[PDB]
Curated annotation (Swiss-Prot):
This is TATA-box-binding protein. It comes from Saccharomyces cerevisiae (strain ATCC 204508 / S288c). One of its GO terms (cellular component) is protein-containing complex. The gene is SPT15. One of its GO terms (biological process) is RNA polymerase I preinitiation complex assembly. Its main location: nucleus. Keywords: DNA-binding, Nucleus, Repeat, Transcription. Sequence repeats lie at residues 7-83, 97-174. General transcription factor that functions at the core of the DNA-binding general transcription factor complex TFIID. Binding of TFIID to a promoter (with or without TATA element) is the initial step in preinitiation complex (PIC) formation. TFIID plays a key role in the regulation of gene expression by RNA polymerase II through different activities such as transcription activator interaction, core promoter recognition and selectivity, TFIIA and TFIIB interaction, chromatin modification (histone acetylation by TAF1), facilitation of DNA opening and initiation of transcription. Belongs to the TBP family. Binds DNA as monomer. The 1.2 MDa TFIID complex is composed of TATA binding protein (TBP) and the 14 TBP-associated factors. One copy of each TAF1, TAF2, TAF3, TAF7, TAF8, TAF11, TAF13, two copies of each TAF4, TAF5, TAF6, TAF9, TAF10, TAF12, and three copies of TAF14. Interacts with TFC8.
DNA sequence: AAAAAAAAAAGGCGCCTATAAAAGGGGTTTCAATGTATCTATAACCAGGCATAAGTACTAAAGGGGGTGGGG
């Protein structure tokens, strides 16, 4: 294909192994918002790497927004370090990436309804609901959002390799339905 | 002809849909079986009204004997 999808977002979970007083975290950490009435967790953001963590009373958290596996682990470590610095027996445990999202640009337009009619068992296209075509790939198990513009969204991957393999697999069919 | 107010219309801003994966708590809202006062059909209750059977007293009858008084 000659193109390599760009990783745009990585979601990871981390068990800090120790109960937390969310009310206290929200009070001593900067850039933290806590509104239990709507979500039972403290939302905290940091600038390097630019990410957002969801911290729970159970001591477990979700780190989002990271653009690489390293930034994800690194950011996760900083959040844990803050929880500690606040006064908890937090530890960096069970780090695990749960989802990777990537995007592409094949540069050419795509006749989506032709692609949907051709691959009916994998794609759901109804512009009324959503402008992009939803392609549910089997191997690897990656969901793609194909747009008329040639823009491609790939998600559902746990290894960055799946995004790459998903894109290579779809390129031929994308090319086949190129508007030209 | 002119100024004036009222109206429709535009452009811009913001947020929504479908995509994605994954760690603990507390909220309101709807629905479960199990019961008072009142309902239903039943069962059972009194007093009042008409017909049949049992007991009543009543009048009803006929049959005779005995004793006393009067007459011959």
């Amino acid at each position: 294909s000659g193109i390599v999808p760009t990783l745009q977002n990585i979601v990871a979970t981390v068990t800090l192994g120790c109960r937390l007083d969310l009310k206290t975290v929200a009070l001593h950490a900067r850039n933290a918002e806590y509104n239990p009435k709507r979500f039972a967790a403290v939302i905290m953001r940091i600038r390097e790497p630019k990410t957002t963590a969801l911290i729970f009373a159970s001591g477990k958290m979700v780190v989002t927004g990271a653009k690489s596996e390293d930034d994800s682990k690194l950011a996760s470590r900083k959040y844990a370090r803050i929880i500690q610095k606040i006064g908890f027996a937090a530890k960096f445990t069970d780090f695990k990436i749960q989802n990777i999202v990537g995007s592409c640009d094949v540069k050419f337009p795509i006749r989506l309804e032709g692609l949907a009619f051709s691959h009916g068992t994998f794609s759901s296209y109804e512009p009324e609901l959503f402008p992009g075509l939803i392609y549910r790939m089997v191997k690897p198990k990656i969901v793609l959002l194909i747009f008329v513009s040639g823009k491609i969204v790939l998600t559902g991957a746990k290894q960055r390799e799946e995004i790459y393999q998903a894109f290579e697999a779809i390129y031929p069919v994308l090319s086949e339905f190129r508007k030209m």
